[PDB]
């Protein structure tokens, strides 16, 4: 769900689409993630790794 499960009923949200809305909350346009979401995933997991 993302940020929804704290307000009320938890609505399902695709995780690739959740990030684009989290990026849009930092003044970064949505298409920044979608154009290079493979790098985002490859880089997020490495940091967690």
């Amino acid at each position: 769900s993302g940020w929804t499960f704290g307000a009320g009923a938890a609505l399902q949200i695709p995780f690739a689409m959740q990030m684009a809305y989290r990026f849009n909350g930092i003044g970064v346009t949505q298409n920044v993630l979608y154009e290079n979401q493979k790098l985002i995933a490859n880089q997020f997991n490495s940091a967690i790794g």
Binding site: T29, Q30, N31, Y34, E35, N36
Partner: protein, 62 residues
């Protein structure tokens, strides 16, 4: 995630891309308000290759 039209990827400037069964609409994240996709409702940047999950559809130019 996006709408493909004429080889150009359309992203919603604000709201979410949704469809019921056939027709595509853009609506906000806190209230289902269906409105037909319009040039003033989306912004185009790039092509239909970098994104994953893009959907072929028509866009109505005002």
């Amino acid at each position: 995630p996006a709408i493909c039209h004429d080889g150009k990827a359309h992203f919603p400037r604000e709201g979410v891309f949704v469809s019921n069964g056939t027709h595509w609409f853009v609506t906000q994240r806190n209230f289902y308000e269906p409105q037909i996709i319009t040039t003033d409702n989306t912004f185009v940047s790039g092509n239909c290759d970098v994104v994953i999950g893009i959907v072929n559809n028509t866009v109505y130019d005002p």
